């Protein structure tokens, strides 16, 4: 799963290449904006969970920079997620999508496939720019 110290890849053109998980929010997207934490614990973030993260390396020229403290929403965990039919998906690398306090990507596009779990999590816009939704 994902947890503080866990570096995820960035699947958007936000400008940040790699981010380090600073904290695990309890993914509150809903109602008006993003909702606030469902508890102060919760140790692992799963595809679809929102986390707070620090930026470890960003590309030269791009909205986001090295050091920025941002919010990303986990789209590909190297962990297995178990869809209800009983099937299991698992990507070769953890990777996330940086976002804003509305849950919209900071980037103009998403790279690589995205866990289809983000669709139930209601992150439609993310699903929107997804090349694929495995």
């Amino acid at each position: 799963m994902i947890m503080p110290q866990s570096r995820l890849d960035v699947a958007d053109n936000s400008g940040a290449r790699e981010i380090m998980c600073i904290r695990v929010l309890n993914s509150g997207i809903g109602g008006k904006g993003l909702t606030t934490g469902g508890g102060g614990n919760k140790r692992y973030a799963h595809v679809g969970d929102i986390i707070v993260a620090s930026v470890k390396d960003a590309a030269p020229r791009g909205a986001v920079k090295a050091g920025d403290v941002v919010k990303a929403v986990v789209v590909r965990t190297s962990h297995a997620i178990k869809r209800a039919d009983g099937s299991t998906i698992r990507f070769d690398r953890n990777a996330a999508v940086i976002i804003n306090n509305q849950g919209e990507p900071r980037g103009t596009r998403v790279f690589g496939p995205v866990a289809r779990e983000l669709r139930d999590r209601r992150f439609m816009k993310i699903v929107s720019l997804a090349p694929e939704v495995l």
Partner: protein
């Protein structure tokens, strides 16, 4: 503890054949699991996962196969229950010549 005489074995088959499905052969080598994604709004989608077969674990209801695929620059593996309602049909694309029922080695 309760010591009744009984083939707990078959009792399970009887409650398991009703949820067991055969599928083309295959063992590795490519496949194309054209599966349904009824999971969108009402809108019943239709994705096709195709790529190397790396594992056949199980038997009965529990039987399944694992296909590895690289999509959009990122390696992806899926686990399918031969008899998973989301699986419409499976078709071989090309028999492969390997040497061990696994291939995990193939993850590089």
């Amino acid at each position: 503890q309760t010591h009744i005489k009984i083939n707990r074995g078959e009792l399970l088959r009887g409650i398991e054949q009703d949820h067991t499905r055969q599928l083309p052969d295959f063992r590795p080598g490519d496949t194309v699991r054209v599966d349904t994604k009824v999971r969108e709004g009402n809108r019943t989608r239709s994705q096709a996962f195709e790529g190397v077969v790396i594992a056949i674990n199980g038997s009965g209801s529990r039987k399944s196969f694992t296909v590895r695929k690289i999509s959009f620059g990122e390696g992806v593996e899926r686990v399918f229950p031969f008899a998973s309602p989301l699986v419409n049909q499976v078709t071989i694309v090309e028999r492969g010549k390997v040497r061990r029922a696994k291939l995990y080695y193939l993850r590089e």
